[PDB]
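User: Need the bound-state model for IYP:
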Amino acid sequence: SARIGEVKRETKQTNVSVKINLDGHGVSDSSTGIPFLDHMLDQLASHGLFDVHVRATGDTHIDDHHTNEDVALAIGTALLKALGERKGINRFGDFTAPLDEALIHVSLDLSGRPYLGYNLEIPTQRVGTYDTQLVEHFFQSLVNTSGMTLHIRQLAGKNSHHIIEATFKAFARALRQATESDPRRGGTIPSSKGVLSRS
Amino acid sequence: SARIGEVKRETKQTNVSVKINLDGHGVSDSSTGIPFLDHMLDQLASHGLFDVHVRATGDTHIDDHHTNEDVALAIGTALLKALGERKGINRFGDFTAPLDEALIHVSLDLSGRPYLGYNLEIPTQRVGTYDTQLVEHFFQSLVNTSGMTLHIRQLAGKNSHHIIEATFKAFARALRQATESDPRRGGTIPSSKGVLSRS
Amino acid sequence: SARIGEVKRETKQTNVSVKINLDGHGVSDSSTGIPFLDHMLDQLASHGLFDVHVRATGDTHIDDHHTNEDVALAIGTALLKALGERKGINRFGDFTAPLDEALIHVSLDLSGRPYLGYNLEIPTQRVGTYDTQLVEHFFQSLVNTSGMTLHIRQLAGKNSHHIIEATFKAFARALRQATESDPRRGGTIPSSKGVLSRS
Amino acid sequence: SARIGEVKRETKQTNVSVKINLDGHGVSDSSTGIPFLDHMLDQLASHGLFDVHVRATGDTHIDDHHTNEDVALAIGTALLKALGERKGINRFGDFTAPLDEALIHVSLDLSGRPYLGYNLEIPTQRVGTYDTQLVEHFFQSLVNTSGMTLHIRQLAGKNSHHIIEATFKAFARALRQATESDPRRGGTIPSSKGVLSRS
Amino acid sequence: SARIGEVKRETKQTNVSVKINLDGHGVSDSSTGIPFLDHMLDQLASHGLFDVHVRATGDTHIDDHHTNEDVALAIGTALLKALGERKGINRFGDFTAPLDEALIHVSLDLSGRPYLGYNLEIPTQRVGTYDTQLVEHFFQSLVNTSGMTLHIRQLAGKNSHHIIEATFKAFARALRQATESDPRRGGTIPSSKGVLSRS
Amino acid sequence: SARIGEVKRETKQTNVSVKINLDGHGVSDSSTGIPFLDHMLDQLASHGLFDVHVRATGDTHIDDHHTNEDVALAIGTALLKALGERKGINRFGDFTAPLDEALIHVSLDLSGRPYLGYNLEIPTQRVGTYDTQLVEHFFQSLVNTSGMTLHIRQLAGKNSHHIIEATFKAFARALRQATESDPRRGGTIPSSKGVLSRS
Ligand SMILES: O=P(O)(O)OC[C@@H](O)[C@@H](O)c1cnc[nH]1
Ligand SMILES: O=P(O)(O)OC[C@@H](O)[C@@H](O)c1cnc[nH]1
Ligand SMILES: O=P(O)(O)OC[C@@H](O)[C@@H](O)c1cnc[nH]1
Ligand SMILES: O=P(O)(O)OC[C@@H](O)[C@@H](O)c1cnc[nH]1
Ligand SMILES: O=P(O)(O)OC[C@@H](O)[C@@H](O)c1cnc[nH]1
Ligand SMILES: O=P(O)(O)OC[C@@H](O)[C@@H](O)c1cnc[nH]1
Ligand SMILES: [Mn+2]
Ligand SMILES: [Mn+2]
Ligand SMILES: [Mn+2]
Ligand SMILES: [Mn+2]
Ligand SMILES: [Mn+2]
Ligand SMILES: [Mn+2]
Ligand SMILES: [Mn+2]
Ligand SMILES: [Mn+2]
Ligand SMILES: [Mn+2]
Ligand SMILES: [Mn+2]
Ligand SMILES: [Mn+2]
Ligand SMILES: [Mn+2]
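Assistant: Bound-state model below.
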């Protein structure tokens, strides 16, 4: 009864397949056509202990944007599917993680209501070939399909790779917390209104 | 083949029923337990030509918040249902409407991607018994379930009732435009990527 | 059943005759004794498709003010007469028009309630022999007798003739929109309160 | 030959009846459904010596706005009717009145041309249950149907009830002055252009 | 051996009864005469897993202040009673929780020394009928009788209901953490000075 | 009698072929050697309903500039050819379109007089391999050969791809409007001076 979400999503621009196990062992298996994003998805598996399987192709000759967005949308849907009615879970996650001089605080609530608060200030435009504007878009798209309340707050940082990587580490650990079983909940839905829904 | 969306939504806090006809004749039939919101929903019908049927009850002794939110969520879902695959529609709407000294520009895209840009500055806290913070929440919740890109821009205004009412008038007219048939489209999906989706 | 409004207005200072057809073909026939105003009224006909007949004489040796005002008052009354109960009309108009570097946004509502919002900053005092303060007065007087809510917003412009002319072009197109038949209205009055009135 | 104006005005939102005698003895008889407004209308009678009869009902569960506006519109029309051709009157009124620390200067001209200049800064949002934004709207609507040039200038004041009440006292006295017979006029129209008109 | 604290507290102004189980299952049973406060106390149970029983009556016709204060004082005493010598507990709690755009960080230490650090900026005066100044007073009074060091820090937020609710969610989770058994402590008092005391 | 403009333009630096149908069905067929520009030209077809055929080659090893410019010049000439004497057309177009957080207002007049007003602030230097300075140059060159008055105004936006794409969407819709038949014009030239000319 591991919670597994699977999504296939295709448009004229991109083709995406995602399989995520919330109760994983950190199996990392991401190939998006965007090497830096693959590296970040590896962090999600390694530090979140999610099993993360992603395959994507797309119109990277135009730019990485459509692929990045469509991967994020599909991951969000996969998370939503895996989570189901959200019975017995912690629901909330909260973690601050460094990478050297960078320090990122991530707080999230698996509420069913999409919201992104994001204040990263990434001081360079490209990390490798990866457009650093795409980080915000990745998280925005992911929250929109997952129905997640997500806050990402930059507390320190100078190196762009460090800032983004620390964000994924903190996110992975916050998401792990939120998705894990609350040992006291007794399988009840963790909401005073009796339901958690993306509608 | 009128496009009609119907939603019933209930929680421990509220009970909501919505029926909206996109191809209506402005039939107004809204009773939310929040008189000012009913007045605004009347504008949606009158100026958008939507048929709007809303019934809600809820925990207004705590405050109008949960009712307001839950009505908005249900309306957004009703719009999504009515819109279907979004074939043959204008998709985009754009209108600036006054009410006396107030002037509000609303621009929207039935994109499938939720976003609210909102800059109203409503100078009083209560219009009648209605908490003016709830206007932003109404639109935010509506975009989240409808999969709408929505921008609301205050160009002028001093009277709070005028500001909010002008917003609903402009929104109604922009939404009417966006939902109406594009006479040249020939029933094609109005997107270069071949699909419009909330996922 | 073309909607035609006719006004004769005389005082000790001026003598004015106006005939306007809302359902016209752009017949331009304006002679006010103020050549620049005649040029602007020509734009109203050409871009609004109104048939515009104006004759005025007055005390232009004192200045153009009284004539300009009295022409505007009479035009506003003519519009009010032509509009009648305002059944079946769009009611609202909204257009932004350029003339070269100038760009003017006009938004109006045939509400029955006079209001002018005006922010033009015309950088010279005379266009030909025409006092550029008289532009604001023209629109103010027109809204007062027509029962129009009118907003005029200068978005760009440097040449005074361009600024004023772009204003008349945008106004003409917004007014055309507002006066035209709403194809869905089914002849109903476009107001939730059941009536549109200058009282 | 007392100058009496009577108006009945009804919409889907409100029902209003007004009778005003310009040559009254201060008979106060106002019941609008808005107690604070009734108190202000009492000042109009007491200090203006108008006989003021007002009855209104309306949608106060939405808010007091529509009632307040519609009462003001009807009062303005009643004044216009009572004034007729404005022969033999002072036409202009000018008065500054205090209420304790508050001091309000009101200047008006029964010109036929609506204009409101208003600079009150009322430091609280509610006086009793009365929304203090509605004061400006009351005067704006009244000038629009009466064809009055009206300037209201706050010279001092801290208490909101005092500020608004002093405004009505000053207005009542300015309006009394303007409506009263000029003992030298000899029944002539007090305008160099030979007529005073709302058109 | 569930840790249960019970308090009955009465004055000439209020009557309060509280029963709290630190080792609860989130049983919510709060009726204070202040609906918004009841909603917040529901969050304490739902997210803290405390069993919370509160009954209060009082002089709400004067305002909600005395009731709010006296409920808070009684809850604090109930917590103190339930906690006893504080053997074997985590003692410290730390959590940041969102509600949509709002994000509140709560840190607390069950030290025996009362202190409130509070920086919320709640942008409206009333949530429903609840005076938003009373939030600070609730926490101040609670810390004073419980002997708690409590810091409440607003990281983001615009909607007053969201800000206050997120505060209670974060507080509930921090308090749950602090009151729970430390699995390594071996029942020792978690203080280098050998005792934790409100004196 | 579809309005079709065809241009072949060659220099030592570039070779360009353009065919545009103003009365198209959104046939997209653009290959410029600049993938991002191709994506933008696809928007022109999809949202403008133009049939757009572009082939270009050029000195992209130097940079994309000459190709971008020469494509724009050729498109402008193609539009001019297709438009002819501009009889019976709307002439003016005005639209504000979003893409998520980006919001761009485009206003244009097919006047015969070239002018570009442009205020985009695109926060990154490269979208994919496309130099973001080239957007302004594309529109400037296009207006110069088409004889178009064009204003592009950035109202909101953070993502460079979104800002540029929203610009093309708004432009396409404004241009569609301007080129479409005015149903009332009766085939007259929409100018008070009797002619529209690039000279
Ligand atoms: O839905 P939640 O479990 O976060 O909490 C219940 C209710 O408070 C919540 O729906 C709410 C949303 N906005 C204000 N409150
Ligand atoms: O999906 P749209 O039809 O708004 O346009 C296609 C594609 O450009 C779009 O998916 C996109 C999203 N972000 C950048 N582009
Ligand atoms: O009269 P309108 O049709 O613009 O809308 C009805 C009512 O809302 C309107 O009379 C009003 C005026 N001020 C606030 N509302
Ligand atoms: O109409 P009055 O009586 O205020 O004054 C005559 C004339 O000067 C007046 O109509 C005018 C209006 N604007 C400038 N002057
Ligand atoms: O009492 P605590 O366990 O927080 O720590 C012992 C001692 O350091 C503490 O009493 C103290 C108080 N002020 C400074 N130190
Ligand atoms: O040429 P148009 O149709 O925009 O309008 C006629 C005339 O006003 C115009 O040529 C002009 C140019 N500059 C000022 N006016
Ligand atoms: Mn995107
Ligand atoms: Mn790394
Ligand atoms: Mn909410
Ligand atoms: Mn209203
Ligand atoms: Mn004048
Ligand atoms: Mn000209
Ligand atoms: Mn009003
Ligand atoms: Mn008093
Ligand atoms: Mn106290
Ligand atoms: Mn709540
Ligand atoms: Mn160049
Ligand atoms: Mn794109």
